[PDB]
């Protein structure tokens, strides 16, 4: 967005009460490493977090 914090003072953000998606992650910037531990990226929109 504009700027993020360091790792020792890790930046925390709270998100709820909205719709999330993974296919919308490939428009504003192309990512390099994307690993969802234990969860396949194709099913994330099919579960309700």
């Amino acid at each position: 967005a504009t700027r993020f914090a360091s790792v020792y003072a890790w930046n925390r953000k709270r998100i709820s009460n909205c719709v999330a998606d993974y296919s919308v992650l490939y428009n504003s910037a192309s990512f390099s490493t994307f690993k969802c531990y234990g969860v396949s990226p194709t099913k994330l929109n099919d579960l309700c977090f």
Partner: antibody
Amino acid sequence: EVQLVESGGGLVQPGGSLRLSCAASGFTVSSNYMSWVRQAPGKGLEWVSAIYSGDSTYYADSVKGRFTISRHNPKNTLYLQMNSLRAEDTAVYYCARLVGALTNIVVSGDGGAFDIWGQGTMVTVSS
Amino acid sequence: SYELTQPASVSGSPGQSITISCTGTSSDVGSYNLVSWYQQHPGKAPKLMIYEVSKRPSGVSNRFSGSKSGNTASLTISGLQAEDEVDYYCCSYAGSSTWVFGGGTKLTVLS
């Protein structure tokens, strides 16, 4: 810094041509918005200039063969070689923005939000 | 040369609700959606206050709204103030990503 600035204003006579320009500052015109709204005070308006680059079939059936315009992305400025200027085109234009659907501003929706304009130039076609 | 019907003269008391419309045809009734309403103090570039008719502009006072049905319209301007004596328009589709809109409803605030 981010601003649309109109430039290249001069006198136009019947039978002549002139190269207008709308220069974006801050944001490069390669991946940004440009909408040329033509305003005459007191009455209705019209959006006319149909230049979205790639050079395919997209045009309005009112200015066929009159308004010719080119594209220059890296220089962050667009030039308007408005040829065959008619004397009944007394209006101050504005290059502006819009909104589509891709980025975080729209994930579900339509878009279409002109939000940043220019200041316009004063070009009169007089005999 | 392309121009659609709008109610030019509209007026309402402060704190009331007024309705603004702009005309289309039967080729615009099945299932599209593109309507964004304008705002102009006369003599300069417009201002955005309402778009995505029934949803949220980023920074805008939530006193204004819009409502959508059939041939029955509303740009619902509510909570009128002394600064609402401004020009208004809509937006609309014309088919195959083309565009058209209405003829400039002008609001005058009384009282």
